Amino acid sequence: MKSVITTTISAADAAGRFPSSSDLESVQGNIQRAASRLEAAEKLAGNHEAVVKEAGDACFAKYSYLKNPGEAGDSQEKINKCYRDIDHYMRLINYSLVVGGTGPLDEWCIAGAREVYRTLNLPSSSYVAAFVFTRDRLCVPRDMSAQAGVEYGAALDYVINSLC
Amino acid sequence: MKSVITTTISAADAAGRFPSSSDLESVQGNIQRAASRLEAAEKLAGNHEAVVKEAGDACFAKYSYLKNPGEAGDSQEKINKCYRDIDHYMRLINYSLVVGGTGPLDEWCIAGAREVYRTLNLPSSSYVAAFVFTRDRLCVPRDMSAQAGVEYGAALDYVINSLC
Amino acid sequence: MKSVITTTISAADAAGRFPSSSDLESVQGNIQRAASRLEAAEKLAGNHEAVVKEAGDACFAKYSYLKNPGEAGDSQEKINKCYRDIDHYMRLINYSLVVGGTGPLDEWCIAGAREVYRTLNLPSSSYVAAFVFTRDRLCVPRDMSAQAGVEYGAALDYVINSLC
Amino acid sequence: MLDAFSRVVVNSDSKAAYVGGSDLQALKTFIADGNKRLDAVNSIVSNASCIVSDAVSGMICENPGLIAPGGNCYTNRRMAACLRDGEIILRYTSYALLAGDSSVLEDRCLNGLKETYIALGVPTNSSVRAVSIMKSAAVAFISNTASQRKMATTDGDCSALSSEVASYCDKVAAAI
Amino acid sequence: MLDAFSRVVVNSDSKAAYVGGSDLQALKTFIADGNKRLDAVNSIVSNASCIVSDAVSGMICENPGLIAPGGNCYTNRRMAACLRDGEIILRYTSYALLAGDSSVLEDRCLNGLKETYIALGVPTNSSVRAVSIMKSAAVAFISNTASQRKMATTDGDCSALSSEVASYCDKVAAAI
Amino acid sequence: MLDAFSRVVVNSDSKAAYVGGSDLQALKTFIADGNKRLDAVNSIVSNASCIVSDAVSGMICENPGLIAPGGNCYTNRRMAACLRDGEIILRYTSYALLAGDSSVLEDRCLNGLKETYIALGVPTNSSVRAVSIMKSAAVAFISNTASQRKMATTDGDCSALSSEVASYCDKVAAAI
Numbered sequence A, B, C: 001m002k003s004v005i006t007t008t009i010s011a012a013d014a015a016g017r018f019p020s021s022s023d024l025e026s027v028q029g030n031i032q033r034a035a036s037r038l039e040a041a042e043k044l045a046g047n048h049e050a051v052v053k054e055a056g057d058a059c060f061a062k063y064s065y066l067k068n069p070g071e072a073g074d075s076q077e078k079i080n081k082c083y084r085d086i087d088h089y090m091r092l093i094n095y096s097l098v099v100g101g102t103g104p105l106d107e108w109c110i111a112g113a114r115e116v117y118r119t120l121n122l123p124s125s126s127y128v129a130a131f132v133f134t135r136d137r138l139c140v141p142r143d144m145s146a147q148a149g150v151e152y153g154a155a156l157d158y159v160i161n162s163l164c
Numbered sequence D, E, F: 001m002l003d004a005f006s007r008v009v010v011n012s013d014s015k016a017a018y019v020g021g022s023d024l025q026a027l028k029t030f031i032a033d034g035n036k037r038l039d040a041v042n043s044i045v046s047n048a049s050c051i052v053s054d055a056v057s058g059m060i061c062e063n064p065g066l067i068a069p070g071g072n073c074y075t076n077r078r079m080a081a082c083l084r085d086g087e088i089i090l091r092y093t094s095y096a097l098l099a100g101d102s103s104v105l106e107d108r109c110l111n112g113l114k115e116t117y118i119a120l121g122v123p124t125n126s127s128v129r130a131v132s133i134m135k136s137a138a139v140a141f142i143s144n145t146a147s148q149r150k151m152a153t154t155d156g157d158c159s160a161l162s163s164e165v166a167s168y169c170d171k172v173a174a175a176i
């Protein structure tokens, strides 16, 4: 799981080194940034249902054609799965915010996503629309602190760039 | 076993590809040439005893020195083994004609042959004489059709070139 | 175990060759030099206690600081281990003289020695002093024949160079 | 690997025999049905995406635990790996159909698959279900009885080829 | 490898849950003790040579057969290999302490160690003794109670960190 | 690998002893017979082709099933592989004779040979027969009693060396 801690430790391990000053300093950075990203994680975990609902609504409001027969949202079960997927992504972002790195996203949502979405006719633009809406909907300080939003928006941007 | 089919399939497998147009076309070639080579195979399998006898006779008529003491044909059992070897080769040619490739020859007669014949003092020129006689003795259309002979002579030439 | 015999055989094995003239000639060299090095081995094995005692005495006479607290010879058990180590080295030299190569030294004393001596604060200069004393103390023909001394001194020089 | 012809040759070699007239007759039958065999392969490879994604999706909709946390299709990485396995298996089955012999499938795909899946934790029961769905799909495309796509061929009888396709899928299911 | 944070995330993922407030509280405790954790690691790595050589020497002085002919520390090659193993184990224990999770140690050091030592003939009982001596040494350096070296820190309570160090050394001893 | 000298040294090292006078005497005996040992090796390597091909041919003429379809010497590929194995074994036996120790043979040739032959299907009984024919041939060439080739040496007694050659061939037969 990609994080400050695992990245530094793996670097040391590859060179067969004990932790030294630079490794301790990296962890210190994790301590320093923890407050903002744990705030963002806590805010997201306490309100994810409304966030997911709004995001999925934005996806289908922007792409009504998804509800046409033969398309990804042509049945209620498929629409439900769309909202479920958005939920999975928000959960992985919650995890990324807690870990301090993109590891949970990289391993549990991004790896293999393109093969899945192409075999399943799930247009990438729809997920991107859900995440763009979420990023633009964030209101500071109404929803979280400035730096918490920097962390939250950065994770959302990382997801979007993975789908670009 | 080297054939049109195995060659094309292995090529596709190395690239992780399903069969496509070129693979199907190759097999079509196997269908087209099957008539001539199966005719040659059938003719050979129905008369191999006389063919082998004639070939071995030609080898010892050209190389009487083989019957001298210390040479490869200095006893009756060794002469018998010589005719047996020629039989094995004609059988492998029968197999090559059926498969449509040189695979049976390559794996069951040619691979390791030079090491064997050198350790056993079996002069390559003797086998070549048996096969040259057989190639030159073929009579068209008395023995088989023109294209059947093209296939039969080609397999014989392949064996000869392997011993060159 | 590095020797004339093993070196030549391994060379032949790497090339998949039977022994040939050069391999037999190498062993002949082992036969020729055996007399001098077996004499040196026999002389060493029959008087090793006095040799070791003299060598250790020379080490501590040259480096009295070793007996200071915190140093390698600050207790009687550690001094005893110093003489024991010198004994081990003389035994390995005895083995090298018998084998005709540096193999026993290379594998049983030199490999890993630097890591051990650095982790154990054992100064290399002390072992070198013991071996230099031994090399310079050798008296010809009082102690052994000229060529026996060439072999004995060469093994000692090899040890010293390993610690340089 | 062997094809139908080299299979005959290996069997003949077991007896140091020249290829018997009976075997030559059978191979001539194989030749006579060659065009049908090529249409059969074309019908599978031209719909491989449909076959694989429908079979993996069916496996999942019959067993939704596969996509719950802990399910072997949970996360995109695992679903992608499973779609890839479905495609690989179909590819080797199509090679066996083109060659007329199951050696390519047995040697380059199935040899060790059971142990590998045990090591990884891939459920064998779910795998056999995906493979049997692909089996029904592939047979339908061979017989040109898929509901949603047709492939125009000259009329005739390809039951033997569909039976062959099914026998290869059965080898896959048996091996795991 | 996982750290304390990714460990929490993996546990949460088992339930398809967002990270619970209880877990967030615990991680905030980890953050609050971060500086103490860094001092703990510094105290071990700054004395790694002392720790390892004292532990290997202790193992030997309690069992001198190790350095007799046939002993697994006999010859410089074996002693060097054993000092290297002691250092490697301490290094992975320090990684576990920095990360707050034992996964790095279990996966990159201990996985297969028992079998390897069986294959080579390294005595497991002597190994556990070296590791438990390192355990006592490391704990002392964490708690700043080593007799011969002190490390100046601001006064406080690092019992939890020393207990963690000990639990990692115990994993090592248990694995072999 | 070890030779006769390093073998003595390894045995001495087991006791942390300097090489005993008794061992030195034995090694001096080895030196004294050095020229005979070199003639012995020359007599084998100078007739290696004869030895190997006669032994493989004998193995086959005593068991003609080896060259029937299904026999492990059937086809030129298998016969060539078997002649190569006979040569390899003789080569390692000649190394053991040159070195005066069987370690080279045990470690670089025989270690794993039994399992390999089980895996491949090479018949062990036929292998031992080829090796024992080579044994008789090699002994004859050492003792200069081969019927069809003589090797001129100064007269003397090489029974010990032929016994050694036989003991190495026996190790080969025992290992499989």
Ligand SMILES: *[C@@H](C)C1=C(C)C(=O)N[C@H]1Cc1[nH]c(/C=C2\N=C(C[C@H]3NC(=O)C(CC)=C3C)C(C)=C2CCC(=O)O)c(CCC(=O)O)c1C
Pocket (backbone or CB within 6 Å): D050, D051, D054, D055, D057, D058, D059, D061, D062, D132, D133, D136, D137, D138, D140, D141, D145, D146, D147, D148, D149
């Ligand atoms: C691919 C896009 C398809 C086209 C084109 C078409 O016309 N039919 C598709 C392929 C196909 N599939 C089958 C057989 C089965 N497919 C199954 C999975 C579906 N069943 C479900 O409950 C779900 C809901 C998510 C899925 C995806 C199953 C089950 C079968 C039956 C397997 C069996 O045991 O018989 C066929 C062949 C026959 C048929 O029409 O069902 C084809 C051509």
Ligand SMILES: *[C@@H](C)C1=C(C)C(=O)N[C@H]1Cc1[nH]c(/C=C2\N=C(C[C@H]3NC(=O)C(CC)=C3C)C(C)=C2CCC(=O)O)c(CCC(=O)O)c1C
Pocket (backbone or CB within 6 Å): E050, E051, E054, E055, E057, E058, E059, E061, E062, E132, E133, E136, E137, E138, E140, E141, E145, E146, E147, E148, E149
């Ligand atoms: C490293 C140079 C040390 C400094 C600095 C220091 O102040 N103490 C050294 C490290 C250290 N070692 C321990 C614990 C033990 N060390 C042992 C080995 C020694 N015991 C022997 O009999 C010998 C004689 C050759 C050796 C090398 C042993 C045993 C222990 C006890 C392990 C146990 O089971 O408790 C400690 C921690 C506590 C202590 O002071 O003993 C430290 C800091």
Ligand SMILES: *[C@@H](C)C1=C(C)C(=O)N[C@H]1Cc1[nH]c(/C=C2\N=C(C[C@H]3NC(=O)C(CC)=C3C)C(C)=C2CCC(=O)O)c(CCC(=O)O)c1C
Pocket (backbone or CB within 6 Å): F050, F051, F054, F055, F057, F058, F059, F061, F062, F132, F133, F136, F137, F138, F140, F141, F145, F146, F147, F148, F149
């Ligand atoms: C190599 C070309 C030879 C020369 C030169 C020579 O003078 N003798 C040849 C080598 C040789 N072989 C043996 C022992 C045996 N060789 C055997 C195989 C032959 N026996 C058969 O029935 C056949 C017929 C095809 C073959 C090839 C066998 C059996 C033995 C006996 C093994 C045993 O168990 O004793 C010898 C040594 C003694 C001897 O003269 O037989 C030599 C020098």
Ligand SMILES: CCC1=C(C)/C(=C/C2=NC(=C\c3[nH]c(/C=C4\NC(=O)[C@H](C)[C@H]4CC)c(C)c3CCC(=O)O)/C(CCC(=O)O)=C2C)NC1=O
Pocket (backbone or CB within 6 Å): B043, B044, B047, B050, B051, B054, B134, B137, B138, B139, B140, B142, B143
């Ligand atoms: C597997 C393929 C195959 C070969 C290679 C083959 C060779 C072959 N040709 C033969 C006869 C013959 N082959 C020929 C050749 C010819 N006849 C003509 O009309 C031509 C002018 C002339 C050469 C161009 C002749 C004249 C004979 C009978 C005379 C003889 O035995 O030499 C015979 C003796 C058995 C028999 O009389 O039929 C053999 C074995 N038979 C086969 O089945």
Ligand SMILES: CCC1=C(C)/C(=C/C2=NC(=C\c3[nH]c(/C=C4\NC(=O)[C@H](C)[C@H]4CC)c(C)c3CCC(=O)O)/C(CCC(=O)O)=C2C)NC1=O
Pocket (backbone or CB within 6 Å): C043, C044, C047, C050, C051, C054, C134, C137, C138, C139, C140, C142, C143
């Ligand atoms: C393994 C090989 C080996 C070595 C290295 C060795 C060293 C050695 N030389 C010694 C004696 C001696 N060695 C010498 C050296 C010399 N005598 C002369 O005639 C020369 C002029 C002069 C040097 C060129 C002398 C003078 C003594 C006796 C005086 C003394 O103890 O220092 C002693 C004391 C034991 C004894 O009296 O024999 C040892 C241990 N002994 C051995 O077996």
Ligand SMILES: CCC1=C(C)/C(=C/C2=NC(=C\c3[nH]c(/C=C4\NC(=O)[C@H](C)[C@H]4CC)c(C)c3CCC(=O)O)/C(CCC(=O)O)=C2C)NC1=O
Pocket (backbone or CB within 6 Å): A059, A066, A071, A072, A073, A078, A079, A081, A082, A083, A085, A088, A089, A108, A109, A116, A120, A122, A123, A126, A127, D057, D060, D067, D073, D074, D075, D076, D079
């Ligand atoms: C934990 C991380 C994780 C992710 C991210 C994930 C995505 C994911 N969504 C799926 C299904 C699906 N996902 C969707 C979603 C969509 N419908 C639309 O209209 C939109 C285009 C689109 C979303 C924007 C749909 C429709 C399906 C069903 C596709 C089908 O069966 O035809 C599948 C295939 C298995 C299944 O049916 O559940 C995966 C692997 N699965 C995971 O385990």
Ligand SMILES: CCC1=C(C)/C(=C/C2=NC(=C\c3[nH]c(/C=C4\NC(=O)[C@H](C)[C@H]4CC)c(C)c3CCC(=O)O)/C(CCC(=O)O)=C2C)NC1=O
Pocket (backbone or CB within 6 Å): D066, D071, D072, D073, D077, D078, D079, D081, D082, D083, D085, D086, D088, D089, D108, D109, D113, D116, D120, D122, D123, D126, D127, D130
């Ligand atoms: C020679 C042809 C060939 C085959 C057959 C093959 C199979 C294969 N599938 C794998 C993984 C996998 N395979 C699956 C497949 C599935 N999970 C389910 O629930 C479904 C029932 C099932 C469909 C079979 C999954 C999920 C993984 C990932 C395992 C993991 O990530 O933990 C792996 C381990 C490496 C990897 O992750 O890609 C192999 C070797 N690889 C090849 O080269």
Ligand SMILES: CCC1=C(C)/C(=C/C2=NC(=C\c3[nH]c(/C=C4\NC(=O)[C@H](C)[C@H]4CC)c(C)c3CCC(=O)O)/C(CCC(=O)O)=C2C)NC1=O
Pocket (backbone or CB within 6 Å): B021, B024, B025, B028, D032, D033, D034, D035, D036, D037, D038, D039, D040, D042, D043, D142, D143, D144, D153, D154, D155, D156, D157, D158
């Ligand atoms: C390049 C690869 C290649 C292909 C693809 C190919 C197709 C092909 N299929 C044919 C016949 C045929 N194709 C079929 C196949 C079937 N009929 C049905 O109703 C079944 C559903 C279907 C399932 C496979 C049949 C029955 C025939 C007629 C009998 C025969 O000629 O074999 C013919 C001969 C008559 C013609 O169309 O000109 C060709 C050339 N030939 C090739 O060389």
Ligand SMILES: CCC1=C(C)/C(=C/C2=NC(=C\c3[nH]c(/C=C4\NC(=O)[C@H](C)[C@H]4CC)c(C)c3CCC(=O)O)/C(CCC(=O)O)=C2C)NC1=O
Pocket (backbone or CB within 6 Å): C059, C066, C071, C072, C073, C078, C079, C081, C082, C083, C085, C088, C089, C108, C109, C116, C120, C122, C123, C126, C127, E057, E060, E067, E073, E074, E075, E076, E079
């Ligand atoms: C068979 C080949 C072999 C060799 C060569 C060898 C060397 C060797 N000497 C050691 C110890 C030691 N060796 C010495 C020797 C010294 N004291 C001094 O004053 C001098 C500087 C120095 C020698 C010149 C000392 C003091 C120790 C104990 C170090 C300690 O525990 O603090 C050790 C560590 C294990 C032990 O305590 O016995 C090794 C491996 N061990 C072997 O098995």
Ligand SMILES: CCC1=C(C)/C(=C/C2=NC(=C\c3[nH]c(/C=C4\NC(=O)[C@H](C)[C@H]4CC)c(C)c3CCC(=O)O)/C(CCC(=O)O)=C2C)NC1=O
Pocket (backbone or CB within 6 Å): E066, E071, E072, E073, E077, E078, E079, E081, E082, E083, E085, E086, E088, E089, E108, E109, E113, E116, E120, E122, E123, E126, E127, E130
């Ligand atoms: C992933 C981290 C890692 C570990 C854990 C590791 C262990 C390890 N220790 C080894 C050897 C060895 N290890 C020891 C250690 C000791 N002998 C004793 O008596 C002591 C009780 C004991 C301390 C544990 C010894 C003596 C050898 C040499 C074995 C020999 O030369 O015969 C070897 C075989 C290769 C070599 O000689 O270096 C491995 C793989 N290597 C790695 O990369």
Ligand SMILES: CCC1=C(C)/C(=C/C2=NC(=C\c3[nH]c(/C=C4\NC(=O)[C@H](C)[C@H]4CC)c(C)c3CCC(=O)O)/C(CCC(=O)O)=C2C)NC1=O
Pocket (backbone or CB within 6 Å): A021, A024, A025, A028, E032, E033, E034, E035, E036, E037, E038, E039, E040, E042, E043, E142, E143, E144, E153, E154, E155, E156, E157, E158
């Ligand atoms: C670059 C790596 C790095 C290090 C090394 C580091 C050390 C460090 N340790 C601190 C406090 C402290 N450090 C300790 C540690 C301990 N006190 C004891 O008596 C125990 C024996 C000892 C065992 C580890 C304690 C108790 C505190 C005070 C409580 C706390 O601030 O966490 C502080 C905060 C107050 C200060 O000193 O300015 C820092 C910056 N910070 C970093 O970023």
Ligand SMILES: CCC1=C(C)/C(=C/C2=NC(=C\c3[nH]c(/C=C4\NC(=O)[C@H](C)[C@H]4CC)c(C)c3CCC(=O)O)/C(CCC(=O)O)=C2C)NC1=O
Pocket (backbone or CB within 6 Å): B059, B066, B071, B072, B073, B078, B079, B081, B082, B083, B085, B088, B089, B108, B109, B116, B120, B122, B123, B126, B127, F057, F060, F067, F073, F074, F075, F076, F079
């Ligand atoms: C299935 C494919 C296949 C082939 C091709 C084959 C060739 C072959 N022929 C052999 C023997 C032999 N082959 C011959 C043949 C000859 N005598 C002569 O005068 C001519 C020079 C020469 C043929 C032109 C002879 C004489 C031997 C016995 C050699 C001996 O033992 O001294 C042997 C050694 C084993 C044996 O004694 O049977 C092989 C491997 N074996 C196979 O399994």
Ligand SMILES: CCC1=C(C)/C(=C/C2=NC(=C\c3[nH]c(/C=C4\NC(=O)[C@H](C)[C@H]4CC)c(C)c3CCC(=O)O)/C(CCC(=O)O)=C2C)NC1=O
Pocket (backbone or CB within 6 Å): F066, F071, F072, F073, F077, F078, F079, F081, F082, F083, F085, F086, F088, F089, F108, F109, F113, F116, F120, F122, F123, F126, F127, F130
């Ligand atoms: C380290 C020295 C060394 C040895 C000992 C060795 C043995 C060896 N013999 C092999 C094959 C073989 N070995 C034989 C030998 C024989 N068949 C019989 O019937 C005879 C009784 C028997 C004589 C022993 C045969 C026939 C094969 C081919 C197996 C096959 O092609 O199916 C193989 C498999 C790879 C290959 O085909 O070459 C090995 C590794 N390779 C080495 O590098």
Ligand SMILES: CCC1=C(C)/C(=C/C2=NC(=C\c3[nH]c(/C=C4\NC(=O)[C@H](C)[C@H]4CC)c(C)c3CCC(=O)O)/C(CCC(=O)O)=C2C)NC1=O
Pocket (backbone or CB within 6 Å): C021, C024, C025, C028, F032, F033, F034, F035, F036, F037, F038, F039, F040, F042, F043, F142, F143, F144, F153, F154, F155, F156, F157, F158
């Ligand atoms: C370059 C490799 C090399 C070789 C090949 C070699 C041969 C060699 N063999 C010798 C003696 C001898 N060689 C033999 C060997 C034997 N006598 C028999 O009747 C046995 C059948 C036979 C079986 C091996 C014997 C008995 C002696 C005389 C005793 C002896 O000097 O060892 C001698 C000493 C006398 C002389 O010929 O000048 C040499 C140099 N020396 C070398 O350095």
